Amino acid sequence: AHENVWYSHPRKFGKGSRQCRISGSHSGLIRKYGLNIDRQSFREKANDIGFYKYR
Amino acid sequence: GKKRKKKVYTTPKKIRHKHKKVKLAVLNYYKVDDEGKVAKLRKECPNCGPGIFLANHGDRFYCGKCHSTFATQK
Amino acid sequence: MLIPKEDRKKIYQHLFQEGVLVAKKDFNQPKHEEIDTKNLFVIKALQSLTSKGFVKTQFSWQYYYYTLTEEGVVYLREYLNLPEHIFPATYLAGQS
Amino acid sequence: QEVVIHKIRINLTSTKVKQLENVSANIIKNAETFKLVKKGPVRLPTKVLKISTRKTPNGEGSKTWDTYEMRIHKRYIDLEAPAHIVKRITQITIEPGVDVEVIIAA
RNA sequence: ACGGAAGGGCACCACCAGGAGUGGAGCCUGCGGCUUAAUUUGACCAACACGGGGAAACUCACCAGGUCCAGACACAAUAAGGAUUGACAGAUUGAGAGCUCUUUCUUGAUUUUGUGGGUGGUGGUGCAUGGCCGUUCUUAGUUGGUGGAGUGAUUUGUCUGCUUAAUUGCGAUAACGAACGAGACCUUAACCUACUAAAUAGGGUUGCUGGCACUUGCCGGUUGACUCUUCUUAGAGGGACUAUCGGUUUCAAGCCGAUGGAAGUUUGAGGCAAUAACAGGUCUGUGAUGCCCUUAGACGUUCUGGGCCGCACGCGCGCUACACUGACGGAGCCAGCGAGUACAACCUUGGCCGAGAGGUCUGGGUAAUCUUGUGAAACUCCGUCGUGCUGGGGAUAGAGCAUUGUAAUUAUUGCUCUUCAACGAGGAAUUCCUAGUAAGCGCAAGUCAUCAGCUUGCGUUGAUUACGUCCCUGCCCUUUGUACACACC
Ligand SMILES: [Mg+2]
Ligand SMILES: [Mg+2]
Ligand SMILES: [Mg+2]
Ligand SMILES: [Mg+2]
Ligand SMILES: [Mg+2]
Ligand SMILES: [Mg+2]
Ligand SMILES: [Mg+2]
Ligand SMILES: [Mg+2]
Ligand SMILES: [Mg+2]
Ligand SMILES: [Mg+2]
Ligand SMILES: [Mg+2]
Ligand SMILES: [Mg+2]
Ligand SMILES: [Mg+2]
Ligand SMILES: [Mg+2]
Ligand SMILES: [Mg+2]
Ligand SMILES: [Mg+2]
Ligand SMILES: [Mg+2]
Ligand SMILES: [Mg+2]
Ligand SMILES: [Mg+2]
Ligand SMILES: [Mg+2]
Ligand SMILES: [Mg+2]
Ligand SMILES: [Mg+2]
Ligand SMILES: [Mg+2]
Ligand SMILES: [Mg+2]
Ligand SMILES: [Mg+2]
Ligand SMILES: [Mg+2]
Ligand SMILES: [Mg+2]
Ligand SMILES: [Mg+2]
Ligand SMILES: [Mg+2]
Ligand SMILES: [Mg+2]
Ligand SMILES: [Mg+2]
Ligand SMILES: [Mg+2]
Ligand SMILES: [Mg+2]
Ligand SMILES: [Mg+2]
Ligand SMILES: [Zn+2]
DSSP states (O other), X not given: XXXXXXXXXXXXXXXXXXXXXXXXXXXXXXXXXXXXXXXXXHHHHHHHHTOEEOO | OOOOOOOOOOOOOOOOOOOOOOSXXXXXXXXXXXXXXXXXXXXXXXXTOXXXXXXXXXSOEEOSSSTTTOEEXX | OOOOHHHHHHHHHHHHHHSEXXXXXXOSOSOOXXXXXXXXXXXXXXXXXXXXXXXXXXXXXXXXXXXXXHHHHHHHHHHTTOOTTOOOTTXXXXXX | OOOSOOOOEEEEEBSSSHHHHHHHHHHHXXXXXXXXXXXXXXOOOOXXXXXXXXXXXXXXXXXXXXXXXXXEBOOOEEEEXXXXXXXXXXXXXXXXXXXXXXXXXX
């Protein structure tokens, strides 16, 4: 694990550049308004976030 | 939903590069002048500072405190 | 891990001074925040402390919140050989 | 001596409404009992913030989708006002939820 | 439960009247199959443009390979005459990896190797499970308390009728009163010359200015001044409840028709949405998780490269078309939902240059302020073409210029030229739909660095045909028959 070879590849961008911040998942991520959280984690925490079903 | 085959290897072996347990490298490093002055052997490191002995390979004396800094011909 | 001892003792000292630490999950990153060490062996040192029972870890949203126990304070003081009277700033009761 | 007219300008923000409305009511009541010149609590289009998500975490099932949202209300106000009474007004009568910002219009 | 049994009601995931189509064509995209080292995987009405799954590195799950240990802690064991680590240069390696080796150095009790023990796992098990949503089931249906009937399984209440979209009511009643579901309720859309206000929205007057007609009229500009709030905003509220009337109705529940109105289908569209259940899907979202498996040449993690996008074939969403209601030129010039740069680098106006994609320099904008009045398309008007697989159609094909990217080859994407194929309204079948509706037309947002044919939402141009029936496909409840109860598979 060379210090310049281990984890060498850049991650400035792309799918893996960002994490769920709740589960660390890559798939099903939401980036709108900087949520940076996935589909379903949003699905339940949104009520505490301030979101509510209206229409 | 899958059963995995055994990882058969067409590779003989790669073992940990064991460090060599050197027995009293300091006698190799120093040389006593009959209960008095003592000399050092084969160089001293100018890039690292006094007391750090250097490496003998060939046509170049080598560092290893700050390893990449000093490997010069002499 | 194989911590250069100075790094370990400065980690422990910072832990004592603050009384607690977070050390965000992100692995493989060079520089841990506000301590000038690598997050990796910070995390591993705190794991070693918890396996000793000196530290209680609450893990929420990938952050590893750490808390010191009194016996952890005692052992840390012994390791950092400070006078027995000193306390982490957490023990300095902030009364508002 | 702080007699210079400040043209102080306030801007509110609230996820909800009634707290914002009563905060604005309190601000205007304080200004009027202090004899100040005001441009009224102007109403700005409440920006709706919408996110549509798939309900199922796995994609199985009939396609069913939901739309969470907030509705943010800003409703800035502004006074042609001196400092100390007005700055004291700014620092009083804040309830949680409603966020207040002040710009001096210097 | 079922019935090619009966009865009374319902539904464009049924039909009727039709509209638009799909199925024929090329393209895209997802399955299967085949192939491959790998084409990682899970769904088979409720799978198939789904897992937001628009995979070039990652995502990663597969494959060829190289690293490292992110093996805490306990014990033993070595061991300070060194547990060990790291290492230039070369061999070797894809590598500028001390991976391994040659040597030598450097490093010092954090270690090392054995025993436990624990972590890690997009490893397995959705037929162990939680949570989650889907479906049964967009229908109207559920349930208990005393009370009656039965020895009991249960039943009545939950019903003969009429009525409603509704177990919705009028009622009748061994039933009585109650609870959930429906409704009620909330969001949105509409109406407010009534209120509150406004240089982050508008309008009038009036300055100062531009052009024309010259009569003082128009059209303009202008962070000038004053004033106003109809338009734009958003708070308080107001407004409709079937109102009024005429029919019809055991005259009750209501249903129909006209007027008033903005609105007279529950005003339109929605959101939540009962009991019971499925061996429906999901361990591949989770540091939700039991068990089992693995835990050092690893199923951990990382690095390079390959694939997930391959091709004898079939199938599902969609796209462009088959041209004259057209294609191509000009000219006209109208929106509405959004979003937008911070610990970084977005929206980008304008002035440059270039044919173009584009780059360039200054700007504004953290946001009704700027992009923006997103000057969008279809469409509108004037021309060219002229029934020709033709100027329809634009796939498949060479070359060039750029752009994002560490990296575009297996063509990311754009632009320029050239090539112009298949295609003649599409068999059996089958989908969706009753008013701002279908259909056409784009735009904004998700994904995003770059990428859409997808998708959510938005607005624009805006209809033909019903306003009914159980004939096909189902659904409600009642009656009935059954050898069914894993329930007509
Ligand atoms: Mg038909
Ligand atoms: Mg079509
Ligand atoms: Mg076809
Ligand atoms: Mg495959
Ligand atoms: Mg169904
Ligand atoms: Mg891509
Ligand atoms: Mg790859
Ligand atoms: Mg890889
Ligand atoms: Mg390998
Ligand atoms: Mg995981
Ligand atoms: Mg199941
Ligand atoms: Mg009883
Ligand atoms: Mg019953
Ligand atoms: Mg309701
Ligand atoms: Mg008004
Ligand atoms: Mg009447
Ligand atoms: Mg409705
Ligand atoms: Mg239900
Ligand atoms: Mg598990
Ligand atoms: Mg793995
Ligand atoms: Mg694929
Ligand atoms: Mg076919
Ligand atoms: Mg579909
Ligand atoms: Mg043409
Ligand atoms: Mg034209
Ligand atoms: Mg507009
Ligand atoms: Mg246009
Ligand atoms: Mg042609
Ligand atoms: Mg078209
Ligand atoms: Mg998609
Ligand atoms: Mg009908
Ligand atoms: Mg059908
Ligand atoms: Mg039986
Ligand atoms: Mg049979
Ligand atoms: Zn040196």
